[PDB]
mmCIF file of C-alpha atoms in Angstrom:
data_model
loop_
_atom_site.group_PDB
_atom_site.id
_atom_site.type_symbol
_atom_site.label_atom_id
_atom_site.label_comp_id
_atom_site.label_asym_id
_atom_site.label_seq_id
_atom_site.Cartn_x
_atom_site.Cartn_y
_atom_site.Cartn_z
ATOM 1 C CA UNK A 1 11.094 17.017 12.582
ATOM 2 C CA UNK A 2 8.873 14.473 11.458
ATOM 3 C CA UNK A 3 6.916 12.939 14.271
ATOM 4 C CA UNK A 4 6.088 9.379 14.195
ATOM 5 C CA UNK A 5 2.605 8.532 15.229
ATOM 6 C CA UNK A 6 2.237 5.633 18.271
ATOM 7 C CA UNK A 7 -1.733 5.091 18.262
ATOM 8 C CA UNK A 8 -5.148 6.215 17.594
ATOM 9 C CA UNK A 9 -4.756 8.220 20.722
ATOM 10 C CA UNK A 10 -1.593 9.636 20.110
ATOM 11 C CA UNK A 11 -2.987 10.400 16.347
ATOM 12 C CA UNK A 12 -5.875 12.487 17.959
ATOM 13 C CA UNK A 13 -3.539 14.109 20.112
ATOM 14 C CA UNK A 14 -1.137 15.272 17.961
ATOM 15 C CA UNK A 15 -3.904 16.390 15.408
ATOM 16 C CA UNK A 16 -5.157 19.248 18.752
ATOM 17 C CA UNK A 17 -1.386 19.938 19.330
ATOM 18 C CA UNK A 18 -1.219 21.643 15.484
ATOM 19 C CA UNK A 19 -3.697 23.768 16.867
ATOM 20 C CA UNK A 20 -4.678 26.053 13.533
ATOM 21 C CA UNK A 21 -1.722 24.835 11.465
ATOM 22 C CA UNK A 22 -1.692 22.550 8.495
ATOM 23 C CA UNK A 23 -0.602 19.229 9.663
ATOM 24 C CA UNK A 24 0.758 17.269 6.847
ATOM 25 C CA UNK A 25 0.665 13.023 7.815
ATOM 26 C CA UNK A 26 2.778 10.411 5.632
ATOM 27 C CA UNK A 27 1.414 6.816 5.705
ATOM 28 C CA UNK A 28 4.058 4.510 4.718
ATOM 29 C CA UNK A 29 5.588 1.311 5.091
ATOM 30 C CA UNK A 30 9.525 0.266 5.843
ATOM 31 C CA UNK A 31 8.826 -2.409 2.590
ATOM 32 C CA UNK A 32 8.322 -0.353 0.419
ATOM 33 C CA UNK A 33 10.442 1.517 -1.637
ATOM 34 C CA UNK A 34 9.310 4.866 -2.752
ATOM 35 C CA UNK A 35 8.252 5.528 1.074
ATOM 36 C CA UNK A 36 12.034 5.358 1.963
ATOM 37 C CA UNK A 37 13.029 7.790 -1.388
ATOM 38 C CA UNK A 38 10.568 10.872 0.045
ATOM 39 C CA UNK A 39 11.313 10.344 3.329
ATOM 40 C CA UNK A 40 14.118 12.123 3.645
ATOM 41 C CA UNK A 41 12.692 15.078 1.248
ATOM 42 C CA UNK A 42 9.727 15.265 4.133
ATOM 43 C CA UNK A 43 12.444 15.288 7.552
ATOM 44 C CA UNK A 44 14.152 18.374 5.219
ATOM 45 C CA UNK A 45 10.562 20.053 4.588
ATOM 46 C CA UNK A 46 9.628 20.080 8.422
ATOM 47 C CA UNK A 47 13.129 21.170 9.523
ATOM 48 C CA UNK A 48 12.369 24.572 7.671
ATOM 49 C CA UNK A 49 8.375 24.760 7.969
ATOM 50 C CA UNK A 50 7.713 25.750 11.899
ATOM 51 C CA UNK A 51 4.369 26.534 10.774
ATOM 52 C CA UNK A 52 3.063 23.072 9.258
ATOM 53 C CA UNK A 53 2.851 19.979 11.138
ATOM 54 C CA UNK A 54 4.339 16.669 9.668
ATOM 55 C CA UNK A 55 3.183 13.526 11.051
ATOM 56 C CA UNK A 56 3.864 9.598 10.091
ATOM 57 C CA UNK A 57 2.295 6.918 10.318
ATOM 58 C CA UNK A 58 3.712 2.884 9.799
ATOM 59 C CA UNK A 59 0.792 1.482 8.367
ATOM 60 C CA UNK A 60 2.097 -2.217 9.625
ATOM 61 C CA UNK A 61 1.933 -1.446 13.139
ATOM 62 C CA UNK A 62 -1.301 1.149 13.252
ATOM 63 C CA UNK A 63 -3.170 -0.694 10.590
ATOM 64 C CA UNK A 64 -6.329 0.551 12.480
ATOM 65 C CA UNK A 65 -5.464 3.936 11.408
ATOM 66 C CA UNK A 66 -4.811 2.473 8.166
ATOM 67 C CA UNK A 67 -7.849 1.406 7.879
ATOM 68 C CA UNK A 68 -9.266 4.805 8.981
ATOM 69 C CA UNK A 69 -7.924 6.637 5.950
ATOM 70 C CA UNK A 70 -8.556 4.191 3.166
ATOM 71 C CA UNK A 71 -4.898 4.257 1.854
ATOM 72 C CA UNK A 72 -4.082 2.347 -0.792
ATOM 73 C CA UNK A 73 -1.199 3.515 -2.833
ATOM 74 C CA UNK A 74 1.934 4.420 -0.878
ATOM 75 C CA UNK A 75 3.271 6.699 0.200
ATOM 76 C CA UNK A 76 0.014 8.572 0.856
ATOM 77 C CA UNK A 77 0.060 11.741 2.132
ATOM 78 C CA UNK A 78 -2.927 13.064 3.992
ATOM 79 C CA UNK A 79 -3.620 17.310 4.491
ATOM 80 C CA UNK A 80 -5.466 18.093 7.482
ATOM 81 C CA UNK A 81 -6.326 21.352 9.423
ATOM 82 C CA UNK A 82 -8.394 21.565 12.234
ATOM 83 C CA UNK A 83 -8.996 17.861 12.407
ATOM 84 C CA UNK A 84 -10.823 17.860 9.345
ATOM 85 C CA UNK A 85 -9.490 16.181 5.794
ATOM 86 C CA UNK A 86 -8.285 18.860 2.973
ATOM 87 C CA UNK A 87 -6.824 16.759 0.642
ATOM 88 C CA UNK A 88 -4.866 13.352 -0.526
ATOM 89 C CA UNK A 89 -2.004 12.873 -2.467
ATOM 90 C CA UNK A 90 -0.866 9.236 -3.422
ATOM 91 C CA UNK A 91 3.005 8.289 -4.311
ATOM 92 C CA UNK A 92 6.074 10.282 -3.744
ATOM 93 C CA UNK A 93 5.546 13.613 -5.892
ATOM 94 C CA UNK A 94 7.481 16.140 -3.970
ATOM 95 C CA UNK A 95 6.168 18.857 -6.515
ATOM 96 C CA UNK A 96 2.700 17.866 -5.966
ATOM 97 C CA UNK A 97 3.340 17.225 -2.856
ATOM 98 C CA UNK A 98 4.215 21.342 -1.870
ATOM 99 C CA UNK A 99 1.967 22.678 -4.312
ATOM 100 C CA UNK A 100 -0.785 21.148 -1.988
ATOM 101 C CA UNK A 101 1.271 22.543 0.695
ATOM 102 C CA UNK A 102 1.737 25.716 -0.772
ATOM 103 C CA UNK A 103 -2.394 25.916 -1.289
ATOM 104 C CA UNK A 104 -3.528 24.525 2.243
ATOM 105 C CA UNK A 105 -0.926 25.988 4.673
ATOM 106 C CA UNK B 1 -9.736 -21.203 -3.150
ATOM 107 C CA UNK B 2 -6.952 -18.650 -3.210
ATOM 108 C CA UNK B 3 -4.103 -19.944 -0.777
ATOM 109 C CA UNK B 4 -2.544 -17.832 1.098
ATOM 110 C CA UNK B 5 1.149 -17.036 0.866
ATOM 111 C CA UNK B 6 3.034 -18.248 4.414
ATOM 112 C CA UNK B 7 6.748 -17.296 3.808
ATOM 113 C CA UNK B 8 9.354 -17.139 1.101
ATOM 114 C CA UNK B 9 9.966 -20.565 1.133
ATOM 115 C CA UNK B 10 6.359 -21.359 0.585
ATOM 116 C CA UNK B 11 6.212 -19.287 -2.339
ATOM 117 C CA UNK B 12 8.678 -20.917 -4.442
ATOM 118 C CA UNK B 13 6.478 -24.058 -3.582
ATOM 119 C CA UNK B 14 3.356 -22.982 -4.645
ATOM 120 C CA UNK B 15 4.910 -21.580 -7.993
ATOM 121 C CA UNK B 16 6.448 -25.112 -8.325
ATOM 122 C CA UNK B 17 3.018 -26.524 -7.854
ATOM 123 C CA UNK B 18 1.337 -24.460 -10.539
ATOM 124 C CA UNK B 19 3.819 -26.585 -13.187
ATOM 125 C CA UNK B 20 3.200 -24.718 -16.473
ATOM 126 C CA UNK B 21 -0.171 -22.732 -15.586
ATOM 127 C CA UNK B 22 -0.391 -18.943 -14.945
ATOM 128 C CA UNK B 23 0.478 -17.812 -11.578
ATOM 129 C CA UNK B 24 -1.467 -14.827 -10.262
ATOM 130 C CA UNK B 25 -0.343 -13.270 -6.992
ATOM 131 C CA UNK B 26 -2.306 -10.911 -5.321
ATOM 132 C CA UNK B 27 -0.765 -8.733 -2.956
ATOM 133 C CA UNK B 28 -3.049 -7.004 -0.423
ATOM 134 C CA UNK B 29 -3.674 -5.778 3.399
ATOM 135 C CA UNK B 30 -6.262 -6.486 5.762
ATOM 136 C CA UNK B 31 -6.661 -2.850 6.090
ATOM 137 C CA UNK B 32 -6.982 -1.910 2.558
ATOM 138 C CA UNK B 33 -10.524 -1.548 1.442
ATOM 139 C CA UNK B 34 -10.285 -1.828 -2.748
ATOM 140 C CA UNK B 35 -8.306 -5.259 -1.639
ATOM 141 C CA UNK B 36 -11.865 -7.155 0.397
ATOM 142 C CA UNK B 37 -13.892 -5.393 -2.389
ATOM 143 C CA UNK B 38 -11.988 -7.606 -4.921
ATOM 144 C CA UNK B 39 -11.158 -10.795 -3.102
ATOM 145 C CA UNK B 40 -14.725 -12.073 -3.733
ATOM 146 C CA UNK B 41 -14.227 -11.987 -7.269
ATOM 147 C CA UNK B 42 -10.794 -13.879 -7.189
ATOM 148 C CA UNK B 43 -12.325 -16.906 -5.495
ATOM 149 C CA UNK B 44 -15.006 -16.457 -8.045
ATOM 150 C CA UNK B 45 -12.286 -16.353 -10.413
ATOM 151 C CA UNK B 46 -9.938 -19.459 -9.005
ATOM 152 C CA UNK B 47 -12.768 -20.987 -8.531
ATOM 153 C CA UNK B 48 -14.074 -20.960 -12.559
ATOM 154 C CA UNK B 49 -10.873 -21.297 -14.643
ATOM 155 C CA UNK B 50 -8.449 -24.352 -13.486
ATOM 156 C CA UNK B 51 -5.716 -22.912 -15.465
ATOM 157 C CA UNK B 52 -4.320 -20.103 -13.682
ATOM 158 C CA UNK B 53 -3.517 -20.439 -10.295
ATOM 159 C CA UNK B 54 -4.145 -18.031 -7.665
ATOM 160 C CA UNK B 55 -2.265 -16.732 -4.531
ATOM 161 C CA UNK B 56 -2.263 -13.975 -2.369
ATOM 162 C CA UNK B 57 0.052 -12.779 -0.265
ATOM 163 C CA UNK B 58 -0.168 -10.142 3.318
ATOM 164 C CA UNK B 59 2.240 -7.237 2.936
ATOM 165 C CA UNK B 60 1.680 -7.039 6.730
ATOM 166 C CA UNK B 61 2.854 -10.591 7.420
ATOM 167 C CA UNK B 62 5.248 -11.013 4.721
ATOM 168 C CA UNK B 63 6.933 -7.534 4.815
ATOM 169 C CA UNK B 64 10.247 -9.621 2.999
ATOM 170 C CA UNK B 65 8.292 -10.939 0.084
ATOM 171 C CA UNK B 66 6.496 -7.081 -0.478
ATOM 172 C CA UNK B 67 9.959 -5.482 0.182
ATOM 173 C CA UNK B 68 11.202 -8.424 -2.682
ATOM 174 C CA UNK B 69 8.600 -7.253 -5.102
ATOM 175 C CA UNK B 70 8.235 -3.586 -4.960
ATOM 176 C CA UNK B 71 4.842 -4.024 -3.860
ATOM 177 C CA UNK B 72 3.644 0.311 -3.702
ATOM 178 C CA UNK B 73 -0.010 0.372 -4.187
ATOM 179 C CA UNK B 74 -2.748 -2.100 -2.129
ATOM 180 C CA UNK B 75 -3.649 -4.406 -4.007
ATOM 181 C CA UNK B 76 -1.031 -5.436 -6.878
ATOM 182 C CA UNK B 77 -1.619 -8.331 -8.989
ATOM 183 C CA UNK B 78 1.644 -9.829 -10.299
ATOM 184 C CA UNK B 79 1.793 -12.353 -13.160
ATOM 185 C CA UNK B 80 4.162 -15.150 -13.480
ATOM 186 C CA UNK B 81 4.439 -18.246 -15.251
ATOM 187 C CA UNK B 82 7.462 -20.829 -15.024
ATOM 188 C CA UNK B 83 9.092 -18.623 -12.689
ATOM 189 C CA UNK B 84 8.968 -15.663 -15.217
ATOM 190 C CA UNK B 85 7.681 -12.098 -14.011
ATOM 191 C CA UNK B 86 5.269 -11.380 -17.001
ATOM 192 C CA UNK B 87 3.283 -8.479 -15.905
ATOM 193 C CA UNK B 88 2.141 -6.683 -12.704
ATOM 194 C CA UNK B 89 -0.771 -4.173 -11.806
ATOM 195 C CA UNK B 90 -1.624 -1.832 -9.502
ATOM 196 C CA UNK B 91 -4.976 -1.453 -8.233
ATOM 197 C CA UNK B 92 -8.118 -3.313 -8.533
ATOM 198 C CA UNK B 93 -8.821 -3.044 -11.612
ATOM 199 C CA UNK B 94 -10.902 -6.174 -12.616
ATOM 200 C CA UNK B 95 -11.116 -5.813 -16.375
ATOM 201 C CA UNK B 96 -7.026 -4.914 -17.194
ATOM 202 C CA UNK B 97 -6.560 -8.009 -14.358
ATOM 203 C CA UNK B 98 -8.951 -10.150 -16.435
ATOM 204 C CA UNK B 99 -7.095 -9.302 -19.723
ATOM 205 C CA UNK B 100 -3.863 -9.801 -18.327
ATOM 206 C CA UNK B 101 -5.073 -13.440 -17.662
ATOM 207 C CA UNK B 102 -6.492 -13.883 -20.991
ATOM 208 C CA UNK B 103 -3.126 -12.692 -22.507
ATOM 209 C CA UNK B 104 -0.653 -14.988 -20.194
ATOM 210 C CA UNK B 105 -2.680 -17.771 -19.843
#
């Protein structure tokens, strides 16, 4: 299950829901293309990991929390535990992408 | 000036406009931060050289046109002249942009 994101409050309280776990956010956009490729990959990924959180986030309708995160290249996936940034990881590299996984869960 | 990109229909007029020059289109989002650090310099820039043409387009307001382009990373410059894709670029990166201009124009 991959959890879309509604607002900055529903952002914040989704972020306290993880409690200790690694929550794992995808910024991306329905335009663009290799958003819609990893997408899929991610949905699988949560289906089997209970333990990590995965969050996403439509940059065209919560451009605010765009803006938050400085993203630039998409999709960008953000690592967070705790509330507090871990790592970054721009464009859709699924190996990179659960190495960082692998290291921060 | 760089003008601002309305719709699709709009942007085959404004590459009709630019005849025979170079046609630079930057695409950005008013939540990407590398994108307002760089639009200074391409007013600078359309303002100085009178043959290339500059235009820019919102991802957030003309989702079609990004979705039409493969725009992935915030901002992309894309090159055209008489219609013709030439080049793109990802990122602001002023001096490869610059080049690419001195190249194609």
């Amino acid at each position: 299950m991959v959890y879309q994101v509604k607002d900055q409050e529903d952002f914040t309280k989704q972020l306290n829901e993880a409690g200790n776990k690694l929550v794992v956010i995808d910024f991306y956009a329905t335009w663009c293309g290799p958003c819609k490729m990893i997408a899929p990959k991610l949905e699988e990924l949560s289906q089997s990991m209970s333990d990590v959180v995965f969050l996403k986030v439509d940059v065209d309708e919560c451009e605010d929390i765009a803006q938050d995160n400085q993203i630039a290249c998409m999709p960008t996936f953000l690592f967070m535990k705790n509330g507090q940034k871990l790592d970054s990881l721009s464009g859709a590299n699924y190996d990179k992408l659960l190495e960082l996984v692998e290291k921060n869960k």
